[PDB]
Amino acid sequence: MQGSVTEFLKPRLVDIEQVSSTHAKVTLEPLERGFGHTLGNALRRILLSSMPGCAVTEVEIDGVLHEYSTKEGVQEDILEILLNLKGLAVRVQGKDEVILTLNKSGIGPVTAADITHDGDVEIVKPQHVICHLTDENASISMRIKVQRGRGYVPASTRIHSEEDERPIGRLLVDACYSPVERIAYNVEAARVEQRTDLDKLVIEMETNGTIDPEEAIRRAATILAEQLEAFVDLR
Template identity: 30%
Template sequence: MKTIKTFPFVPTNIDVQQIEPNKARISAYPFETGYGITIAHPIRRLLMSSSIGYAIVGVKINGVTHEFDSIRGITEDVSLFVINLRKLQFVIKNTEQTQIVVNYSFSGEKVLFGSDLKNDEVDVINPDVYLATINDDAKIEFSLIINKGIGYVSSEDIRSIILDTFIPVDAYFTPVKSVVYEIENVLVKDDPTFEKVIFDIETDGRISAIDAFKNAMQIMDSQMSIFKSELKITSVSNNDTEPESNENKILFQKLDVLNFSARCSNCLDKKGLKYIGELVLMEESELKSIKNLGKRSYDEIVDKVKEIGYQIGSKLPNNVKEMLYKKLNK
C-alpha cells in the first residue's frame, strides 16, 4: 500500500567486490524510483574525468636539443623514443608527492624496456613496454618529470609550466579504463519499484578501482559542500545598514573544500577540526603539535590557507569569531 512520504528512502546496503586487482563491482540499494540514474550518471562522469593518475609531462635527454633530433648509438630517434615513453604507466611511490624528476643512465648493448625504469621512487605498471635499443658503444642519459593529475593536459599547455630544457609531453592522467552501471529493481516491503545501482569499474593499474571510486566520492562531496552551508537571508534595516560581507564566508565552510591530501585530512579529522575558520584561528605552535602532522602536511595547510587569503593565527573580527564559535558549539 502506497503511503505519503515526507523524505525519500535512504539506501542502507552497499556491496564492494574486488574482482581483479584493477576491477571492482560496487552496488548500493535500495534507492527510490528514479534516484538510481540521478546518482549513477554523475558518479560515472567523475570517475572517467576526475580520477587521479600519474603521467610523464616532460623528457630531457642528455645531448639532445629538440624532439626531432637523433641519439648517437640508439636505434630510435628522439621522437619515437618519446612516443614509447608516453606509453608507460607510472606510479609515484610517495603518494604525498605531486611531481618528481627521475634520472636514468644506461650504457652498453641493451634492449630497454619499461621494467628498467623501476626504482625506489617510481613503479611501472606496464613493464613490458619496449622503449629503445642501445648499441654496445653507446650511452643514454635522460630525465623524466612525472606528475600526479587528472584528465588530459596537452603538451602545449605543459610547455609553459616546465623548464625549457625539457621536451613537453601530452599527459593522459586518467587511470580509469571503463565504468559501466546497471540499475535493477529490488523489493522493499512489497514495493518492487525500488532501485539497485551496480557499478563495474576497471582501471589500468595506476590506481585500484576501489580507490578510484573513493576519490570520485571525495570530489563529489567537496563540489557539493558549497550547497551544504547554511543559507541565510540578510535583511537591510531602515537605516540602510549594509548586508553582511561575503569576505569571511569561506571561514564557515567545511575543510573538504580545500582538497587536502589524504594524510593531511586524516590528521585534521582526528584532531576534530571541521571548518576552515578553525584552522585560521589556530596558532602555528598549536597546528604543529597535531599528532602525526609532518612538515610536508603543515606546509600544505599553510599554503592552502594562503590561497584563500588568510594566514594561520590570523586575527579575525570579534563578530566573525563569535559566529564561528556558535557554529562549532551547535
C-alpha cells in the first residue's frame, strides 16, 4: 500500500533495451544505504549452479572413428574441430534433444552459419570459425546433439550409450550447462522523491547463449520467491 514514507511511494525505475541473447546492461534505481554488494553477491550465489541449461553432450563425426584420427581434405585435426564445437552456444526452446544437420563440400572455411536452421534452434555466433577446408572432395558432416542439464558433471559417471550399441564411432564429451558467464556491478548513487542517500546498481551481465537472460532471471526470481518462504511455519 501507500503506508508511511520508507520505500512504499518509491518506484523502482527498472527498464529494458535488449541486446539479443548474450550480454545485457542491467540498470537499477533506487535502493538505500548499503544495497549494492549484497545484490551482486546474492545473485552471484544463485546464478552459478541453480540455473539449468542446454549444452553439448556427445558428438558424432563421420568415418573418422575417434578423436585423434585424420580426415582427407582438412588442415586441422578432429580434436581442434571438436574443441571448436565445445564453445558453440545453442538455444533450444522446448525440445529435450535435437540433432543438427550440417554438410558442406569443396573449398571454404565452414563456420556456424552453415548449420541448417531449425524452428527451435537459433545460432548466437555465426562468425565462429571451426576449421579450414581444402579441395579434393573434402566432405565433412556432423550430428550435433543437445541435451538438458545444470551446472558440471564429469564424463566418467554419466556414460551414455547412444551409438554404443553395435555400430560405434561416439564418445562422451564434457558438458558445461551453466549459462551465466559474468556479472559485474557498479555501485553510483541515485535520487528519487522520498530520500537522497539511494544507491544507481548498474550491472554488466554476460551469458553464453544457452538460456536467455530474461527467462533465466525470471526463473531465478521465482526460485528466489520460493526461497524466502523458509521463515514461515512453526515446530
